[PDB]
Amino acid sequence: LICINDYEQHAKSVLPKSIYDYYRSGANDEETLADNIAAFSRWKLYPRMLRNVAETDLSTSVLGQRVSMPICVGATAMQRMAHVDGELATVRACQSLGTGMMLSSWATSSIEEVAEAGPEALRWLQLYIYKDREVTKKLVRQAEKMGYKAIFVTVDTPYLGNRLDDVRNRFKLPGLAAYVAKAIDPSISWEDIKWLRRLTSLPIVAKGILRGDDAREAVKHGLNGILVSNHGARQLDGVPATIDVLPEIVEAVEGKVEVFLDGGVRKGTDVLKALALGAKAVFVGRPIVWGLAFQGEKGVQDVLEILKEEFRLAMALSGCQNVKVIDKTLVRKN
Amino acid sequence: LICINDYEQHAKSVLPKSIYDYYRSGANDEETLADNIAAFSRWKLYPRMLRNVAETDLSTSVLGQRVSMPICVGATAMQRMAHVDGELATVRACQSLGTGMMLSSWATSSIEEVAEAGPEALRWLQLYIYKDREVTKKLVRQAEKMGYKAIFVTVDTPYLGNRLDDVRNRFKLPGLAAYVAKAIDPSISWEDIKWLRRLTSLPIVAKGILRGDDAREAVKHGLNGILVSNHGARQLDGVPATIDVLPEIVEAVEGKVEVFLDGGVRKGTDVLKALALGAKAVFVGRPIVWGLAFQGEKGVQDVLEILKEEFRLAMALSGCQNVKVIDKTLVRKN
Amino acid sequence: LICINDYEQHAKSVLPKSIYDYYRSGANDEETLADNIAAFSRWKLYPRMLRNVAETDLSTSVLGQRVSMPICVGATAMQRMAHVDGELATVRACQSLGTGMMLSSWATSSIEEVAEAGPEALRWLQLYIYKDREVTKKLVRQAEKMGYKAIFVTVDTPYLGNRLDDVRNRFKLPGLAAYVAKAIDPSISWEDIKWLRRLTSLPIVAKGILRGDDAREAVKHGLNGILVSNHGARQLDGVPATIDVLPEIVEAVEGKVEVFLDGGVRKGTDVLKALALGAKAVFVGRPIVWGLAFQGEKGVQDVLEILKEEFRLAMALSGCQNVKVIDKTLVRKN
Amino acid sequence: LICINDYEQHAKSVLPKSIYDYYRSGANDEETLADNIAAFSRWKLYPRMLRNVAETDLSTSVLGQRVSMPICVGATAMQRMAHVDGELATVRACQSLGTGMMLSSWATSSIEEVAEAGPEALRWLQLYIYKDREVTKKLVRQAEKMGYKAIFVTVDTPYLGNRLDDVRNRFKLPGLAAYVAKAIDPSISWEDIKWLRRLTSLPIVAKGILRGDDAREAVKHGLNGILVSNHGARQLDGVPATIDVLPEIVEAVEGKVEVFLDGGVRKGTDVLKALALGAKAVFVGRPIVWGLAFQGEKGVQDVLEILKEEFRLAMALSGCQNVKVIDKTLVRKN
Ligand SMILES: Cc1cc2nc3c(=O)[nH]c(=O)nc-3n(C[C@H](O)[C@H](O)[C@H](O)COP(=O)(O)O)c2cc1C
Ligand SMILES: Cc1cc2nc3c(=O)[nH]c(=O)nc-3n(C[C@H](O)[C@H](O)[C@H](O)COP(=O)(O)O)c2cc1C
Ligand SMILES: Cc1cc2nc3c(=O)[nH]c(=O)nc-3n(C[C@H](O)[C@H](O)[C@H](O)COP(=O)(O)O)c2cc1C
Ligand SMILES: Cc1cc2nc3c(=O)[nH]c(=O)nc-3n(C[C@H](O)[C@H](O)[C@H](O)COP(=O)(O)O)c2cc1C
Ligand SMILES: O=C([O-])c1nnsc1Sc1ccc(Cl)cc1
Ligand SMILES: O=C([O-])c1nnsc1Sc1ccc(Cl)cc1
Ligand SMILES: O=C([O-])c1nnsc1Sc1ccc(Cl)cc1
Ligand SMILES: O=C([O-])c1nnsc1Sc1ccc(Cl)cc1
């Protein structure tokens, strides 16, 4: 297969409508789902010519840890619905490639099983502050023990988003909105973030910030990064594309913490634009799932290599031999 | 049924083309009809994270009177064409929900019958200043006697709008433009508003203002609110979407009177954007009619509950525990 | 028939493709043809409420002469291809309605025959400065003798525009680009306009100006008006919609001469927007031809009455009792 | 055939999908391919009236050499795939017309064979700085010996662009990305341009610059022109349309060297807009290939004459008797 969009159409075939719709969906009318993609098109590239691009180096670092490319795997729940191997395939592919994986909450594999499947792979844990604070506490402890290098706290889901396709055909695995309400605490504030900060010395990244002020607030509370994310357009519909908010957030943080982006990344040029606008790395969600549905582990590895090569070429044609050379002048919005 | 747009398609089935077309239509080319919806999409949401949203309270007040949500039923004529119960179903549903209903002119039920059907429901009367001033005078007196809490004077209809579908297949119930010309006085000015002001101490709201200067003029003449309305895009085609004019009107009124909006509200996020831009409450027109055509009273109650829950979720995901927390920074226009 | 767009589809039926295509076409890719219509949609209306609109008066004046409405018939060549009566039907309909007609060059009726068919109708002559100056001279003399009240000099056609459909199927009546090259002088400058000015004391209007500087130049050379026109999008494709250039031209002329508009007028609201932006009257081209193809004289009269009533309603709903009340604040561009 | 777009559809018929797709393609999603065309539509024309346009003269000069029109043939590889005569047909047609041809790298004809086929035709050579510097050196020497009047150095291809259709069906003539990597040196910098400058006293034009700073840098290094080009949208997708970047480049160069444009030119009005924005001449790529596929030499000659006449008419209708009269005020962007 040639590009990421071919993988989605192949996953559509191999997967039951019920399950493909769950992975594909955005919230309500899917205005933001469409805009995550479209916004990248509105950012035009202004490449520099005649720079030595012979040995294009894609390596960078995420929160102190080296990675082979600024493209890492984002947290998506219930990966075993896409392929029998699920999270284990994902993490093994990340290991092959030298990139990191964010293990999702409601993963279809344990934190321990993931660690063992990819012992040398870079691993981070995505987590919610649950009603039962002890559950959050145990997860953090387990992540520390099992060699996970960061905690991503998702802050944009006091309740689960209203995804129309999920209701039209009811859904379950051994609706979804009720399970979230029982477990995830809608009352949480910056005080509950102070608690999480004292709970661990691991780098914590606030996942799902879309506002400048909230970003400054994250910095003030001693967190170590912002993942600019609209939760794959699955939460509040009508929020801007994450590539559009990224500038405001990059500027608000004033270089004090690393800023990352997910939502809409499907091409090498997407990666380049995000890094030009100031993101340190990007995360992909759906593309990994589509890879998984096609060929499990080899599917994920293929998806990440297609993105890797596309990013290498896009870097080369922009006159960027390494990631440190990328700058704001490479992009301008129409 | 899941969302408001499903109700319209169901009403299309159950209703004769002649009658569905009457409820659906805008004026001339329906440019504004389309824009009432589309404009909401152009207003993007910038939600705050990590605010306590455990006990989301949707209650507010309209012209001194408490309501359960900032979503109230707008005036639409001839509701018995949609369902045998018409206005009686509508008002009973509003009573169940704790919201208000604007009784329309040319209602298929009397002011007295409506009052009795929903004695404890919040009720307002929509009215025109008719040629025969006594007819207007009696209606006002009746509204005072029957427990109606406000008068909405529609000021945007000196003549009836040209709705193409209404002419293509002639229309009637025991064309429409002739009945309006006989009854509604096209000569009326702010002097006729001075008259209406002295006529009653009930709160009067100017319904159908689209200009800043006209809004200031309404304030100057001692009226108690502005309903920013383009009459469901049924009057002058080529006027802006009401969500677009709302800022100019909110600013022109300088907090001296409450400002409301109708036209295009179909989703919880619509409600949120209107309130963010400064409206106190919104009115829905067509959605109530579609509810009525589907299941009469239960249909209207369902429509309003779908909107209610959608607004609750949208509020929660924006970090708004109550309506007093909503502010201008929640929205920015593309 | 209800609106102007219904007339075009009826004319499509009754006319041979060859002849309908000639009347319909724009130049090259028809970018401007589309934009003449579309631009009107981008101008939004901001109506005033509660102004006495009981006796809406549509009468105004064109170059000193009273007319019943600011909607007049523009010059279109070869009207007998659409209906046996051609120009005679057109002028008789204008007489019925109390509006003016611009007789076209290459009319399928003589200046004398037109004058006799509508003796009391307001008549102007459209003219080119031909290579043979005597032909232009005779036409001017004839127009003076036959009671024509103005000369419209078309200045945007040194050569005929390239209309793709006209070449695909060759065309003729007892190609077209060769006849223009033989007759119309491509060398003409403002000096040839000085000549035309001294030739007659009739009001002369420069037809087809699209630039501010050219408009000032027309004023300087003692002409009496500007018809802002892109020749029905038939000349240079990729020029702006005439409703877009009208502001720049209205401002450049500084109230020294009357300014008119044609191109794209199909609805009453079009007329209103043009007058709001400062035009004194508008001309319609194609709609008259479509009227003619449907019912000859009654067809033209119907077309003009539909426009008349639509303009009356649009005026009323904007709060304009007469044309003198229309002002720039009625419109704002998106 | 009437216009350039008819030629593409005819070439689609006569050519195998494999070969048509190679000539047609852009890079990745073809965002820029579409925008090269679309951007011209966004530049509107503001024609002057009543200027003597009797003897419209289209002649100008490219790098000191007279040409019959500001429309020249751009470099496209492997022209014999389109027609048995290939480059020989192209150059003979340019000779007939009095315009120049840029001979492409990977031409299906030798530099010597081209020179002989069109001895009196204006000829320039397009070239890459190859890994083997001697190959570049020989080409330059040969171009000097064989009467070529300029060297166009393509600077936007350190690696070949990723054209999806080329991979879907593999391609070859007695994939393509491997041949480029073996031959074209991705390491080259402005120092390798200094080398090329000392290598010849022929005018050198930097082909494929899209940035203002890079243009200034080209000027500083003693080059003689900039060809504003995005390589027919075949390299980095998501770069602006060349007509959009042309202003920034024209201004950055401050009249010190001639600036040219290719990419998207299909109509006479395109040529006019490019020259209005400050380009001295434009190059066409694909249209020549489509001409070639239809009727070889007569096909190319037809294509160039259609463009020539369309440009003549567009010039005339703008009030431009010659190319020296074209100015920035003729265009404004929407
Ligand atoms: C199938 C699905 C499940 C997801 N599950 C989670 C989750 O459990 N926790 C979380 O923080 N984000 C979750 N996300 C959001 C992703 O972390 C990420 O923000 C999003 O997928 C990025 O957008 P993309 O899919 O266009 O790459 C999920 C997204 C999808 C598509
Ligand atoms: C069927 C129909 C009848 C209406 N009748 C009246 C009316 O009698 N008086 C009035 O002031 N507005 C009337 N309106 C306008 C509504 O009060 C309200 O402005 C509009 O419906 C809001 O737009 P919406 O339908 O998109 O919610 C009517 C609208 C419709 C659709
Ligand atoms: C069929 C056709 C013939 C025309 N003939 C002339 C003409 O002879 N002289 C002239 O100045 N304009 C001519 N025009 C342009 C019209 O005067 C007028 O500018 C144009 O029709 C207005 O645009 P509209 O058709 O959208 O109303 C012609 C237009 C059309 C459609
Ligand atoms: C078939 C094809 C082959 C091309 N080969 C070359 C080439 O060998 N060297 C080069 O500098 N540009 C090459 N180009 C780019 C052209 O020189 C030119 O930039 C482009 O075709 C202009 O865009 P247009 O096709 O829309 O006119 C090629 C373009 C195409 C379509
Ligand atoms: O966007 C998404 O799909 C999600 N984000 N956080 S949980 C989630 S899906 C989900 C999976 C399992 C359970 Cl129990 C509840 C919810
Ligand atoms: O938009 C609308 O449908 C309306 N607005 N005011 S009356 C109305 S419809 C109407 C109903 C009944 C009569 Cl008698 C006249 C008109
Ligand atoms: O737009 C148009 O159709 C026109 N404008 N001026 S003449 C014309 S059409 C025409 C009619 C007759 C002759 Cl002989 C030449 C040309
Ligand atoms: O856009 C294009 O098609 C191109 N630009 N430079 S070479 C080229 S195509 C090509 C032809 C032949 C060989 Cl060997 C390699 C590449």
CA–CA distance, A252 with C26 (Å, rounded to integer):
51
On chain C, the residues whose CB falls within 8 A of the CB of D317 are 156, 158-159, 161, 235-236
Task: Name A13's bridge partners.
Answer: none
d(CA D258, CA D236): 25
Residues 6+ apart with CB under 8 A from A6: none
Q: How far apart are CA C170 and CA C317, in angstroms?
A: 47
Mutation for testing the C interface, residue in B239, B245, B248, B249 having most C CBs under 10 Å: B239
Best CA proximity match to A71, nearest among A282, A263, A245: A282
Structure tokens at B265: 């509200």
Q: Which residues of B295-333 are buried (b: 16+ CB within 10 A; e: fewer)?
A: bbbebbbbbbebbbebbbbbbbbbbbbebeebeeebbee
The experimental resolution of this structure, in angstroms, equals 2.8
Buried b (16+ CB within 10 A) or exposed e, D181-200: eeebbbebebebbeebeebe
Say if residues D232 and D286 touch (Cβ distance below 8 Å).
Answer: yes
Residues 6+ apart with CB under 8 A from D88: D109, D113, D114, D117, D118, D297
Enumerate residues 183 to 222 of chain A having a beta carbon within 8 A of any beta carbon in chain B. 185-190, 192-193, 206, 208-211, 213-214, 217
Q: Which residues line ligand 7 (CB under 6 A)?
A: C 77-78, 105-106, 157, 176, 179-180, 231, 234
Pocket of ligand 8, beta carbon within 6 A? D 77-78, 105-106, 157, 176, 179-180, 231, 234
Among A308, A313, A314, which residue's Cα sits nearest to residue A59?
A308
Burial of D329 (0-12, 13-18, 19+ CB in 10 A): exposed
Which of B4, B83, B104 best tests ligand 2's pocket when mutated (most atoms within 8 Å of CB)? B104
First to last CA, chain C: 32
Among residues B130, B102, B34, the alpha carbon closest in space to that of B260 is found at B102
Helix axes C17-24, C4-14, angle to 10 degrees: 150
Residues of D in contact with A50 (CB under 8 A): 155, 188-190, 192-193, 214, 217
Residue D79 DSSP label? G
**Secondary structure E strands in C56-135:** 60-62, 65-67, 71-73, 100-103, 122-127
Size of interface C-D (CB pairs under 8 A): 80
Q: Which helix (H) or strand (E) holds A260?
A: strand A258-262
CATH number at residue A202: 3.20.20.70
Token look-up 């990723």 returns: D162
Contact B207, B154 (CB under 8 A): yes
Contacts C193 to D, Cβ<8 Å: 50
Q: Which residue, among B225, B266, B259, B234, has the nearest Cα to B245 in the 3D structure?
A: B259
Closest-CA residue of C relative to D51 is C189
Domain of residue A219: give its range: 1-334
The two counts, helices (H) then strands (E), for chain B are: 13, 12
Name the token pair of C111.
């200046």
Method: X-ray
Neighboring chain A residues of D245 at a CB cutoff of 8 Å: 46
Bridge pairing between strands C204-209 and B60-62: unpaired
Known binding residues of A for glyoxylate? 22, 128, 163, 231, 234
Chains touching D by CB (3 or more pairs below 8 Å): A, C
Closest CA to D103 of D149, D42, D57: D149
List CB contacts (< 8 A) between D51 and chain C: 189
The Cα angle at residue A42 between residues A38 and A44, in degrees rounded to 5? 135
d(CA B196, CA D125): 84
Q: Which is the closest atom of ligand 8 to the Cα of D154?
A: 6
The two tokens of residue A236 are 């509040």
Residue length, chain B? 334
Q: Is the dihedral of CA D330, D332, D333, D334 positive or negative?
A: negative
DSSP notation for B126-153 = EE--BSSHHHHHHHHHHHHHTT---EEE
CB burial of residue A220 (10 Å; 0-12, 13-18, 19+):
exposed
Is residue A204 within 8 A of residue A151, CB to CB? The reply is: yes
Please indicate if any CB of chain C lies within 8 Å of the CB of B29.
Answer: yes
Q: From residue C143, give the alpha-carbon distance in Å to each of B105, C208, D78.
A: 57, 21, 64
Q: What proportions of chain D, in percent to the nearest 5, are helix, strand and coil?
A: 45, 15, 40
**Shortest-distance Cα residue to atom 21 of ligand 1:** A285
Chain center to CA of D64: 18
Is A50 within 8 Å of D238 when comparing Cβ atoms? Answer: no
Q: What is the 3-class SS of A58-90, one letter each residue?
A: CCEEECCEEECCCEEECCCCCHHHCCCCCHHHH
Q: Residue A68 contacts by C-beta under 8 Å, 6 or more apart in sequence?
A: A58, A59, A97, A98, A99, A308
Cβ-proximal residues to B242 (8 Å cutoff; 6+ apart), any chain: B36, B39, B210, B228, B229, B230, B261, B262, B263, B264
- List of residues 6+ apart from A250 with CB closer than 8 A: A259, A277, A278, A279
- CA of residue D284 to ligand 4 center, whole Å: 8
Best of B106, B227, B235, B289 for a ligand 6 pocket test (most atoms within 8 Å of beta carbon) = B106
Q: Do chains D and C touch (3 or more CB pairs under 8 A)?
A: yes
For chain A, how many structural domains are there in total?
Answer: 1
Helix axes A31-42, A268-276, angle to 10 degrees: 80
Q: In a 3-state reduction of DSSP, which class is residue C262?
A: strand
Question: Helix (H, G, I), strand (E, B), or coil: what is residue D3?
Answer: coil
Q: Does C66 count as an annotated binding residue?
A: no
| Among D113, D60, D115, D120, CA closest to D96 | D120
B149 burial (CB, 10 Å; 0-12 / 13-18 / 19+) is middle
Q: How far is A8 from chain B (nearest CA, A)?
A: 27
- The whole-angstrom distance between residue D254's C-alpha and the CA centroid of its chain comes to 22
Classified as helix, coil or strand, A259 is strand
The finding on whether A241 has its CB within 6 A of some atom of ligand 1 is no
Report the amino acid identity of residue D252: A
Residue D61 to residue B122: CA distance in whole angstroms? 81
Backbone angles phi, psi at B277, to 5 degrees: -75, -10
Other CB atoms within a 10 A radius of the CB of residue B190 amount to: 16
Angle between helices D17-24 and D4-14 (to 10 degrees): 150
Tokens 């990631």 appear where?
A323
Which residue has 């005080």 as its token pair?
Answer: A191
SS3 annotation, D223-257: CCEEEECCHHHCCCCCCCCHHHHHHHHHHHHCCCC
Residue type, A11: A
Measured distance CA(B108)–CA(B125) in Å, rounded:
14
Mutate to test the pocket of ligand 6, among B176, B185, B236, B288 (most ligand atoms within 8 A of CB): B176
Write the DSSP symbol of residue C56. -
Q: Which two tokens stand for residue B289?
A: 């009619």
Query: In this structure, are residues C227 and C260 in contact, taking their beta carbons and an 8 Å threshold?
Result: yes
Q: How far apart are CA A56 and CA B156, in angstroms?
A: 66
What is the least distance, in Å, from the CA of C173 to any CA of chain B?
37
Helix axes C286-318, C17-24, angle to 10 degrees: 50
Task: Give the sign of the dihedral formed by CA B112, CA B118, CA B122, CA B126.
Answer: negative
Q: Is the dihedral of CA A82, A87, A90, A93 positive or negative?
A: negative
Cα–Cα distance for residue pair C149/C200, rounded to 1 Å: 11
The catalytically annotated residue of B10, B83, B221, B231 is: B231
**Can you say whether the dihedral through the CA atoms of A261, A263, A268, A273 is positive or negative?**
negative
Q: Is D237 on the interface with A (CB under 8 A)?
A: yes
Q: Does B6 touch chain A (CB under 8 A)?
A: no
Phi-psi group of D264: left, alpha or beta (phi > 0 → left; psi -120 to 50 → alpha; rest → beta) = left
